[model samples]
Target: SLKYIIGMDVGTTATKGVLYDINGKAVASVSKGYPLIQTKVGQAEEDPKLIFDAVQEIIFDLTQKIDGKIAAISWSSQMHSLIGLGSDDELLTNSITWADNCAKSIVQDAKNRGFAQQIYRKTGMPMHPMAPIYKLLWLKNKKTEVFSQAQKWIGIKEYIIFRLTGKLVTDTTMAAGTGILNLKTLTWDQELLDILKIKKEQLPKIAQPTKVIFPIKTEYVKKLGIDSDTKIILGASDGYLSTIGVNAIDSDHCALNVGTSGAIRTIVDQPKIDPSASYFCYPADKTHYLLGGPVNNGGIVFNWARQTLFDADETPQDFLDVAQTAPAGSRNLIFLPYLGGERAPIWDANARGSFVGLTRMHQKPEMARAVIEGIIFNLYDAASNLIKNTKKPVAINATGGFLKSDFVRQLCANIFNVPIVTMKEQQSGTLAAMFLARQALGLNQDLSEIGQFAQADKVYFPNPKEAATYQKLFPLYCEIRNALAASYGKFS
Candidate 1:
């Protein structure tokens, strides 16, 4: 009866439940989404209760309600979320998400002391406000009451794992994003803990991603309508699993996931830090390392441009229709898509959006074209830095909610100057977790066939006609980006 595995992806905006058979076909998929709690710009958080409730609903719907013989539940999650638990195991403050920029001063202090680089080299995580290391510092200094009463300093995955297993533990894949776990040693960094005014006891035990960590809690076993022997695997983070999902695990292929935020990653044999810390290096699992960068502005910018610049009722097709009217490079307009502060290369929390090369001749259609171009160009920036550190990618395997737009896919092909391989499945991380679950239980071992199983065969080629234009415009885009970033500082 070991016919199915439920792969759960805990994301920034939604929790998805994907049911896959032993032969790698997805049977049923369910999702529950939540909104952000942002009172102002540059601040984003979410209630853990909402996520917990969503998880409860999604799992129950996929399991007890579906009547599938679920063999295992493999979990994947978005990285860089800090959730606190009180002494009585109650939720204290809301989950501080990756989009939160409240740790600016803490990051600045660490950078001023050169400790930022030290942590980056040791931990393979950038010294940004999103990193839990600086976020913990901000909590200690600004939110002292919560810091003093905190019983556990963990990510959202750990919070959920504890509820399911009654075990305080985290997989190395989740631990890699913490900025407190040693990239080489795969253990908590004592020096960082000391600096954060924390003890080792406050953190969870780290384990391998493929490890079947525990069985379902006694109450949840009956509650979930599962057997006592039903097990769960600590699969991996969505950041790296997206690579596994697309089978982009080589030097020749880069995996790109563009959801609410975006990341471009490739697998490496060892965890190595870039001297500039432009991108991140984290473990895909125990044996695989991933090197790439993440961007704060992704499809969210698409939504912004569609609603803010154009009418909300205007369909994406309408927007694309107008964007196609303008030629590549958008009549020399270069839009910096930093509505939300960006990461990867320009690690600035105060980085603002701008539309350079403006003139009286440009219209709304031109502006729309620049914004669309800007999204892909920003990713090109990350990819440029990544190739500097590793092998040049001949192709990019793409996945995510953003790929729903054929325009987005073609833009990536033209901008990146690489073949874009796409698939129909958008729940890529969920499929990857299911693959890992089968491997963990000795049902499968060949993970590289995932791309084939997922039917990621569609190809998009760079428009040769537009390639020359983007080639000339891309460097200018980078040039304007730096100059305008300096200008933004002057104004702010």
Candidate 2:
């Protein structure tokens, strides 16, 4: 009889499910997208019920296609989502995603008070608006009704796992991103809990990624047509798992993902924090940590350019086609892709987007090209921070929708001056879930076996001329970021 594994990734814009075989080849996959609600400026939210329904729908959609029995189901989820529940287990607040910036003032206030470094040193997460610590602070100060009335405070992954297993538990990877978990101890920090004025019981108990929450609910079992024996394996966050799925779990390898947002991460044996506070160190597993930086702007910047520069009717490919018309340096036009604020390298929530050298000589194509290059340059800046801490990677494993474009891949190669490679499985998150599922089942544990599933589909090497041009232009890009960083709060 054939056995299957299910890996479901609940992401920012969608819930994705993939059915994989023993060798990790995806048998089938399904994705269901939902809206990101922006109630006010810098406020990004989503309906928890909608995400739950999408998860159910995708599971059903995937299981219905296969005749084999499910071996196990693991999860990969977006980090830094905060939710509140009443005493009756009813949801009291919308899911506040990582992109939410309502806590901008609160975060800045904390930094001004000099508590940011203390929090980062203790938790391995930066004191940014994306963290739930700031989110809880904002709720306590602004939305007292929700803050005071809530019985439990948790993230989206914990909520979903609770719904399925009836246990309010979270894996270490998800917990590490919360700014309340002590990375060294792998438990809730008493100091942080005291600061938030919340009891330890208000949060989910921390569990390892391999911990099994046995006996999934009969309701979900019957809905997905799986056996009642199916077990739910606790998995890590998408960002951390992306490293595993890409086979970048060691010092010599780094994973770079460019989706709606982008990140560059490498695994380390110990927790590494930057004195400059440029990179984040999060839990990878019991024995390792993830050292990296995440950027707020990525493919979304291209989407914004499509509507702003080109006609709103232009397709993504249409914008890419026009972007190719511009030269390697985008003709001296430098765009700062801070339209939604920034994360790594400069954790400024008030940073605004602009084109530095806008002139009559620059056309739509140059602007488009600059926007695209600007986004990659921001990622490169983040990558530089990660590289400084770890051994330079032999090659960068690149994944996400950005790899769909030849221009973006080649540009990444030139800008970073490293070979960029994409895997056969485009959905690295799902592949990562599958990797964890096999671990829970006592299947292959050796990291070398990953080569069977994560083979490089294409490799882009740097062009000498393009690399030289970007080498000269990359410094100007950094100077602009630094200048903006210095002047951002002066006007306010």
Candidate 3:
């Protein structure tokens, strides 16, 4: 048996794995990135085999770095990406990710009938074309061959479970993204099944966040450099475990993640659904739920600028240096960070990136700073809406790659007008898995104790002047979202 727990976070661009002890101390971490297939205007896909290859590579590498069988493997993965599989557990197609809005017509059809709002209220999740409902419809209409051969529709995380073991299962976090799960019963929704016309067997069995859904087999265990019987604790979507990783499980706790993507989330006592289909809600645990205001654009904006605007081979620190030089508000230059379609609050897929109020005085640094501030301002819309709904004060427990940069930290603090604290380790995925492993083995006293593993390495308090500027810019952002809503339907 191993002495440590393993946590894996399958990101959109990378597969990250970490080994940690019961106290959430990291022993080792491995990350491997894969390419995304972006063909259509709003479509992004990844080969399912490539993701699993990245996963196995990390597991094998981490096993050599650490001693003993991985006591258990837990995961937190990017939410709402679909991986199609055949009866023999074969991959049918690439994963359709959260950035994909190709199923807008299907989403609209559901919306027109009011079925969209009804399901959102039932599941506490918003309407998005990313869900299996629309993706399945898209396949049926456009790519019938793939749809006909698909034996099961699995999220990227659940598909990971299938590759590790001969099982097909999804935790409630991933299930909620499907738009067909019943949040109350934590089971597949029959009504949704009828609507989609998919049988229950086509979906993975839904379970709790800490559920040990499967065990690693002897042969695959050897492949991964571990003992045959090493236990693997199934984990939830990366978004769900993110809240857990931040120790934002309490009713009062709230978190904002501004990594490759950005989102503002709050832990709620129970699930709440806004029938307007504006916000997303997924279960955190039996006692708590998460209301997410996520923006598809986050740190990726900086990533794009570095490659597209600056030199292609520029390093991360280089991007930060450029951004740091630019003042807040970019001298009236504003960026709408919709390189991909947006979710949460707006739910508009037609929104694209724009630079507003640019003049002959604009510089690269100014544009870079505007990119970061604009994404943060977009996140503020989510923070404001979520806070209003719960009547709760949201404190900042910020974590992500962007948090690594002092520039992004300061910009976010200024935009949100809240103190932001970052974790010493960005292995929230691994820490969450470690915590789940502890719970499974009867080692945990209470969930709150897991907070010890989290260290507040840095604190960024609000800048009065920048916060003042953001306060005025935020209302205009809301107007931009409303203006773009109608255009999305034409593409759908």
Candidate 4:
């Protein structure tokens, strides 16, 4: 009998499990969508119970499509989501996601105290509200009762693991982003935990990404209709796995993903913490670490512009049509697409979005182009800081839904001044999770071989002429961004 591996991706808006054959080809996949619970400003949360149900529904649906669960279930989840669990290991509070900004004041205070850099040097995590260390501080100050009641503080994936396998554990890759994990040492920073008033016993046990546990929870086993023989593998976080899926582990090739949000990353042999806090370096595999930063605005800003411009009538094609009507750079008009608080390069939670260089000539049409250009510009800022800290990339493996735009594809190429290549495997997170699962099964232990499973699709070359124009404007963008830094929290 041929066994198959299932790569599970528990993301922000959805949960999916991609079943892969022994050869790493996608056999079948199922997904279920969920919504964020936003009851107040600066608070983005999710019901962990709801997310766990989504996982169950996705896996149960996937089981119906497959003959037998020959192999195992590998897990990959959204990073930095904080969930508080009671003594019984039951969810006591909603999952605070990476997008939340409730910890803005805490992050700012940390930075103002000057120890933010000290912590960053040790943890390789940026001083951002999204990280759990600050989020816990927010709880301790605002919701002290809940913070005191929390017997355990874990991520969404860790909670899911407990539900499935009766074990409370987290992978090293996931913990590296928490702002409390010592990246080089691969251990929880007990000194910091003491400051949070959290005992080490309350934290999930850290394990390797390839660690395996047999037999799902009996209830899940029966509900999912798979035999108890099926194993569960603790895979890396979604960001790290997505980087692996694109085969961007080398020093010279970076990876870029722009969906609702965007990021630019380069993998390096050793961990390099950015002194400016403009980039984040987290341990990826055994030898390499992901060095880069993420942008809160990407295609979402473009979508916001389209919706505001044409109401409900504008399709992506229609939006691009209006954008193409304008000149490149939108006639020197720039838009800072930071509608939400931004991350990377400037880890400002109170940062707001705006249109700079607006003129009477710049209406909806030119604004559309500026919106597209602005998104690329934000990512390019992160890329420059990334390359400054590390070596320049020969090419970037670009993925995500926004790449459907041929114009944006070229925009990425021009702004980054690196050839951007798309990959055939769009679901890099799931694929990479399965790759990790294979290693757990003792099938293929070589991590480098994961790249060959997905091939490159198309390559967009940079135009030196237009790239020169962007190079000319890059300094202006930097100045405007730096100027906006002082004005961020005050206006809010």
Best by lDDT: 2
| Candidate 4 lDDT by residue in tens digits, 198-247 | 88898988888999976677888988767778889988888888888898
- Output the better candidate (2/3) by lDDT: 2
Candidate 3's C-alpha runs over 4 A off are 35-43, 142-150, 303-334, 355-369, 392-394, 464-466, 476-492
C-alpha TM-scores of all predictions: 0.93, 0.92, 0.86, 0.94
Which 10-residue span in candidate 2 carries the lowest summed lDDT? 446-455
Error of 2 at 374 (Å): 2.0
Candidate 2 local accuracy as lDDT? 0.86
User: How high a TM-score does candidate 2 get?
Assistant: 0.92
Candidate 3 to native Cα RMSD, angstroms: 3.4
Tens digit of lDDT per residue, candidate 2, span 117-205? 88899888887889999999999999998888899999888898889879999888999889998878878889989989999999998
Per-residue CA lDDT of model 3 for 391-439, tens digit only, reads 4454588887876777778877888777787877566666776787788
lDDT of 4: 0.85
What's model 3's lDDT at 179? 74
Lowest-sum lDDT 10-residue window in model 4: 62-71
Assess candidate 3 and give its lDDT: 0.77
Off by over 4 Å in 4: 358-365
Full candidate order by lDDT, most accurate first: 2, 4, 1, 3
